[model samples]
Target: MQFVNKQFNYKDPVNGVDIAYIKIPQMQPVKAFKIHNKIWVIPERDTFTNPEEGDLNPPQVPVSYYDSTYLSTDNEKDNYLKGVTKLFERIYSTDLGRMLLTSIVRGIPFWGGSTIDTELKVIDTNCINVIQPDGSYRSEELNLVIIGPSADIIQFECKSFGHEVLNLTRNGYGSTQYIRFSPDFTFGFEESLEVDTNPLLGAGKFATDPAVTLAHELIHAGHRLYGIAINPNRVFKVNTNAYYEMSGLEVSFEELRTFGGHDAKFIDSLQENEFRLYYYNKFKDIASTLNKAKSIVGTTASLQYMKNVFKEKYLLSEDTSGKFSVDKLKFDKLYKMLTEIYTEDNFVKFFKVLNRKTYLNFDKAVFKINIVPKVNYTIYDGFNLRNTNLAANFNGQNTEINNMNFTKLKNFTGLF
Candidate 1:
């Protein structure tokens, strides 16, 4: 057993003086000695071990483990476990969801550099027994948990458990890199399902459901996996900036301006962020776009090429401001044009132009979309930081019309 120096504050009863002592966990034999009417405790330091270098191979999906004491009855545990299985089934069912899962499983090429083999797997477990520097177990409860050798969970665990736990010297990478969903995860998912009428919009009452959360976390996991895989020799070193760059374009672009750099990283991050935010913002518009396309192209022809039709029409259009506004007429004309030239494979090329226009950056070096920082505010207002419109320059102008008023936006991407 190892010992850590913990401060124990005590008010001396007789003298009324505050005294601090080095505290240690109580041992079975009670290693202490009485001297001058005071008990002196003996402390032992832990032995450190270096971990072996290798890629992580997580356990197969649906393989769950939890302490019986963590939850109440067997039914609760069974339901929780079933929730994990069902979530996976739902994810694998959809094309987009399957791609996200595949990214987490096999990992993607990191900015065309190295292969980020996450070797990640999802499991159902709430038991977070981390070994402290003093060789003691520090347990914690997590709903949607992510554990990995180079994951953010390790940093959190270091603070909660001990800095020494990062090594996991005893277990190493073998037992890490898992997306764990706890028993409590189901409650949150179920609650979201009741309120979330549209999961793709990610706004208003359409809060992120479990599936969306899973997709978001998978992206995070891929970045961490890239961190480790890129620098195999220096696996223990935490490359926070690199991970941040890998995570998002806005992040990397701001970081580049801060450090002075991003031709490829900038472009890659931009495209990726645009793709992700576009999906989150406009996915709900897919069905609406499809319905409109079907009316024009005939339901039979629309249904025959549903996937391609939806992809082409949806990607070509923008997230409009109103339902019955002038933009609706513009969209109708665009939809008609799209359906006429629907056989061409160049819709993707056209989408790049639309996507670029949506997330327009005025400053070539720094990304200044519709970012409004908190510093120079004239009036108090509540706005969501995650709003793509707030982060984008939609109308080729560096301004945001909030509350029916135009505000000159400042470059505040680095605030994050």
Candidate 2:
């Protein structure tokens, strides 16, 4: 088991941390800010003006903008988009007027919210087990529970993706337990059929989310790993910049700013003690990349055509290696991060595993199921990291998978 390098109370093995912050460098009061021409920001925040109709005003839950402000989910099928367009103008102060509305499928989140979400209940179960025809028994216990509830639990008759979540909640081969890294990933779906529901119903966030979510997670890691950055706000802005780094889409070239960058302006200055507090400090770099500063408000409505089944067929390590030595030098660092975030698990290695059988399980319920990692995980035990880690290089992890050289294990890919 990966033990804490420091004392429990300044004296024993320690491990426990909880993630309470969703860091945003966008620097905006809310997420309504625009990135560029290709993408805009629109959230599901509104109320039912026509309460007399069969409409539900602001949803029962809040579609949040990270730092405690939430958009009401209630919107009229007819007038809501108009209101969102109005919001785009009020915030960005532009007259994109009705320009952004065309790209939005309606009620989607800054990231990816769900059109059909399945609930996962934690149940008491001993890992994945099976019985043989000879009456033999074998089972594993990962100590995690997930119960899925589809948007339409009735007509669907069958449960949506169920095993995917179960697959991640396993023992570390040592004593590591459960932790919530990407809760949104654990629950969200995509639908090919054009939605004809409420005006704000959103299809699942697809490829676009990984880039956004990864940036968020990366910032979290940065904060925990290197608390004070050379440029404090630079870390979050990196997300905005990262998005701009992408090559294909029109949005990538539009901005070099975050949601909050617009609010920052030079406060002006004087040299009190010769510290040279002269005239300027606001980041001008952002405005310069915006391409057209005025239209930087609205929704990324254009990204609605974003898709799934288009990238790597399996889970690729977001960083470090296409694979890592499970018994290498990274355990101490990962343990510290988890404990600092209030998680009790001792995830010693970063050997990410992808179960091929799990990826193909699609349908409305596919998001409900959990996918398995490697066959015999050893985060707690001791895995052959050489063949398991999700490589940052996986899209090009190697020329081909056969050359990776794992005799006992196989990398899983889906319908790709």
Candidate 3:
């Protein structure tokens, strides 16, 4: 690709090479400036630039996607794993149960042929690592990635599928979930890019599509790795709720166990609110894209699924047409709530709320709960059991959006 601006060239007789320097605005830095068979190198600089505003960009290919065993030695392969492990160790000690770090060694050796017991690592290096900032970083959340895990440690994980392939299961380990996505050796939550479905919806339209899903999952992962890690002692109550429900592995820590009913209520409310924050924070496209789709496809169950998401999570009004936009006040309120919870230091206030034994009142408690209902969806006619989509043992038949009475939904700020 040609540089957008003018260029200049020079000759370095001593080095026996031609040199070129060009200035381009907002251009990404690269290793060398290649001009007509001439190589003009630029010294790579390492600096930590953690931008405050979030950048809406795809994150690095996480270790979850790699087939580590394909590499010859564990040395080079272990670098990425170490980056991830360093974060866990710096944050959660072994007390959080197995921070699964494993090596997927190639060959038929080591018994059981890649069985969990044979392939598992206490600090699993089998997966990839979060790389340095110049690249391997650029999380849209912060608009930049922390070069070192210890820098912030506020990153999170999607904690979804692909764990079994690497034998990094943390099942039965505290609140951690050990899940299998089906038929063994298949990936249910992997991120894959399908053709943009926006065009079919018409120009200027967008959809969460697969990319949105991946970004949402990435934020979840970032929370696991960074957010919660940084707030280890935020004095939070543990929700002893069964982390797993049916099969299919979608069951989360369903409810809180160690706190008063009020705290439990608060946690549940906070969980849903946090999810809304996530959608707003990372998956805005999914919301916006679907808003457009609402008008194009009449009675499209798929489109309606997302429409319900915006209606309930985003507090959309009665317009019920393609023109519907997220309530700015509602969006702001939720973002404010997220900012409060994610403040890290404010977690003290959260704990204080629980300690004070304050609970959501019965009057307000009766408000509508926007439980994110799940549906069995597929691409086109057949099941999409490839990279990210998978049919497992779990499914939610009811539509929470339809069942929810929006009139009862308390102000978003009320949850706090």
Candidate 4:
């Protein structure tokens, strides 16, 4: 976890770290949680107990994952309770949970782990510390990894499994996934990269290569959480170089979350967009490499490993293929969309419809405005866009020449 301690100044009293995280960790306490049809739930006040008090006396992992009300050994009740103790023992314990976190974040306890690492002094979650536009004051300390020194608090949240969190909080700045990946000893609703399969599509490219999935997806979330994701309007007025410098802050957050404890690398910091772009570009090759393995070794080993733990789509949210091929579109559609979104005028039009004076002034209006959707706007595949090939290619390669083919489709104000 290598991250810089640099933080941007803001006027409105808000959790700078909250805004700093790509997917701000809404550090909500989990009591007895459940995953319904793949989506994760925190169960509101019914989460067993108030987590902030750190007094959630969970009914031992065995009691929680199973039912003791069974009246018969041969019926559904008996079958339900049959191996629940073993199942939870394997699925949701503290040790297993950390293992699962490493699989996704690539080593380190997820935000909700026993080894809690936060910069904010232990404060009361009951008090209204930071505020948001929806009249919600942030009381939960977000889950993120500190990339700098053991003492530094610069944190970053990886939206690798951004879907579960986005589905819950719709905290789109990045993943604050409330659900933890399965079979982890410390089961949680945090997020994971290892079990990335769309419940609908049933699998993803990363379903095979654990490293690629972990590195690529985690980095993707880190950038959004920590790097510079400015509103296109902000950058539209400035030169590309200045926008890169100013908007680059968001990447710093994610970078910190990725290279935790290791010596800080420039791109390693989540706030550096350039680094994200660099690493993202590097991931496409991994995807390509995995494609080759599908036939040589087998996709079954990976896909089944994922399914045994949980049923999720292998492809990302936007990934429309195989089982969901009915909804799939050509990759060219994205190429065109990218072209149109970045056109100077359309970018301006987008802000024109926003709360211009105040909202548009922020540095990271949206992850690289061109790469991501707008703020406060809801889209189905939000995380997919975040963990996408293009978003990952932040700085590694030059695809500009390839992007020009869609110029006719772009409706903008410039000679792009």
Candidate 5:
């Protein structure tokens, strides 16, 4: 879509300093079609772009409209597209998925009963060309899109862009936002589900459920809807024209505290805890089976059995001969923590606390910070740190100062 550059003059609420900034309108979809029982929105292509020079805008079309001539035939592109489509289909078809979808679409109440309206749409491309400072275009990869509100948009409408500004724009403007499969999109948990592998170990990063990533993006949308500026502390002058830019995905401490009434440590602590919850759920079944097996066979033998299962079923070997292998001690320790310490009841309580949306009441003990190595560490190192911390603090027995650990993890990993 053609991004319209608009300039606005405003006063910063924090400092009362006058400011002027440039904003590119959020991308919009021109047409939609269905395939595999899921809707796919095609973004309006710029009339002067390279892929197709002419304006080939179609209001609506059949699934066959995207034939080889219309879309790329590369195998990787096809697989990625199909993978994304399947994720949407899964969300639409499941009960919990539908509930999450409803919460996002209808908006969730946050920070003193204000509702944060969020919208989701699956689009056809992995990247969008954003206007750079030089007036040239640079394509940015996107797995999910949640265009943050421009400073002017926030001034005009307190939270989101709202229906007024969205309806006024005719270049395929709507509330529908887009997501696609990019190299950055991780489908590890989804892949594990399909292949019957350990979802926790499937990917080195915290495994993402197809729906969970959508929820994560919706949280960002909520931040925008509440006028919570992301990285507001990092905003600086962009050029001689007095244009400004915010540089990171992080929400600054002051902004978090001021806008959402959230604690300075709210974002990372909540996010890391959320990740831990999802990971625990993903590994729940395996943990149960192993716990039962351990009760009968004992810890040492059961541990050996677990290692063999991973070596055989997951194709993980201890030596360098295999494609992947795990540290035996770390693996055993992780297994013990998952099955023994982080019980199902604790997970239920954690989920309940999250749903209650009482950020301050969150049990710091249950959401302890895990320490990763400073440098030269693999994904497993991070995973181990996370679980170990969870295990140590599950019962509130290890009271070595929660706030300090939180800060340390945030500083070291940038993702506590």
Candidate 6:
């Protein structure tokens, strides 16, 4: 309900004209928990745990088959699979080369393909939902659908799910819908065991421990809560700049184009030049602060860690350029040259000269064209102007979270 005035569109009752753009609502009060060094947002209980009957068994008809995606109910099969899974787990933790072998074996999609997975049809529900004496139902305590060497950890069992996908699916509340995680690139049992709150003396006022990394993710959780970002589904679908921005790196892919209209129409287009430019600067600023954090940390490790975990492990070949191309323009660019690229003053003058300017369509696309904004959402929905709109400023809003006030939100050490 705290709508910031910066993204006002034309012909709107609230800010300008009726067809205005505004920030839509996002979830709030994200609960953060410590799991070793990293923090993950717990998803809201907007969905049901009961698997749909049709979805419960894939490929229909109940043919004699292998379904290792869920827990296995068969005692004999499960016992053997348990041992097989443990062996693979040990292989992963005990030896790097054998871990590679385990990783390779995990890719096959067959009964024998998975050593730990057993058919779901036979297994009983892992967590039974019981009615309280007061009859109030309590949702299951969910964690990332994780897989690795340890059973003592509190994570979802990911046996049948594809090898690479873990804890990627999330609800709007930043909660886990489901996915899988691997130990190689992702932080695992051994890496997460020690919560590093040590000061990063090398970076001077930075973290030598996992605390900086922890702050990075928790800030994302706040963004989700205060309506500062996209839904969880569209979170990582961002471009490389935004991707690296999360890890405090100023990287680029250069080709900024949207695949389709946001509301699925030419009129309400994100690919539209003016809107896109607005958004481009928006994300650019967002990643910069994290970039600063990476710089302050004084190591490419902060940036590189995420590059491997979120980028190298998951994204398809076509989406990634393999290497983040350097920003040659900023290397020795002149002051005047930089000014021309981001000439907002020039734009302001143009608006005044034409006697035609609105913040939403400052380029006058809506004024000149026959386009109409999409009807799906109110025109008052667009990007927020400042990071202060959300609890934590994501660098700044060129455009663009937790439960606490702004000051407390940035300091994760106190949260522990």
- Candidate whose TM-score is highest: 5
Across 1-416, the per-residue lDDT of candidate 4 in tens digits comes to: 11111121222133323331122224542211111111122212121122332222323211022222212222322222222222222222223222333322321111211112221112121112333456454444232321110110111122222333222111212222222111111111101222211111111111111112222233333233322222223222222233234545223332222322221222223433443344333223223322222221222234323222211111212233312111123322321222222222222222121111111111110111111122211122111223334234221111232131111211111111
Q: Which residue pairs clash within candidate 5?
A: none
Top lDDT prediction, candidate number: 5
lDDT of 2 by residue, 1-416 (tens): 11112111111111111101111112222222121221221232211111232222222112111211222332221122232222223222211212112211121111111222221111222222323334343332222111111221111110011122322111121111111122122212233223211113333221111112222222222222211111222222222222223422122100111111221111112211111111011111111222112221223222212111000101112223212122112333332232232110101111121111111112121122111123321122112224445234231112123222222111111211
TM, every model = 0.24, 0.18, 0.21, 0.22, 0.26, 0.19
Give the per-residue lDDT digits (tens) of candidate 3, residues 35-73. 222112222211112233123222421112222232123
Q: In terms of lDDT, which candidate is stronger, 5 or 6?
A: 5
The global C-alpha lDDT for each of the candidates, from Candidate 1 onward, is 0.25, 0.20, 0.24, 0.23, 0.27, 0.21
Q: Regarding lDDT, does 1 or 2 come out ahead?
A: 1
Off by over 4 Å in 6: 1-88, 94-143, 146-416
Q: How many steric overlaps does candidate 1 have?
A: 1
Candidates sorted on lDDT, descending: 5, 1, 3, 4, 6, 2
Q: On residues 229-297, what C-alpha lDDT tens digit does candidate 6 reach at each position?
A: 232233222322332344443211111111111211222234334433443343233233223332212
Error of 6 at 397 (Å): 54
**Pick by TM-score: 5 or 6, better one:** 5
Overall local distance difference test of candidate 2: 0.20
TM-score between model 1 and native = 0.24
lDDT by residue (1-416, candidate 1, tens digit) is 10112222112111111111222222232111111111121111111111231212222111122222332344443333333333344444554445434433332111111122212111112223333445454432222222222211111111011122222111111112334323132111111322222222112211112333333333333333222111222111223334234433343321121111221233354543443343333334333433343222222323324334333423334344312111444444432222122211122122111111111121111111111223211111112222434333222122223322222122212222
Report the C-alpha displacement of residue 276, candidate 1, in angstroms.
18
Candidate 1 lDDT (Cα, whole model)?
A: 0.25
| lDDT for position 210 in model 3 | 20
RMSD of each: 24.8, 26.0, 25.9, 24.2, 25.6, 26.5
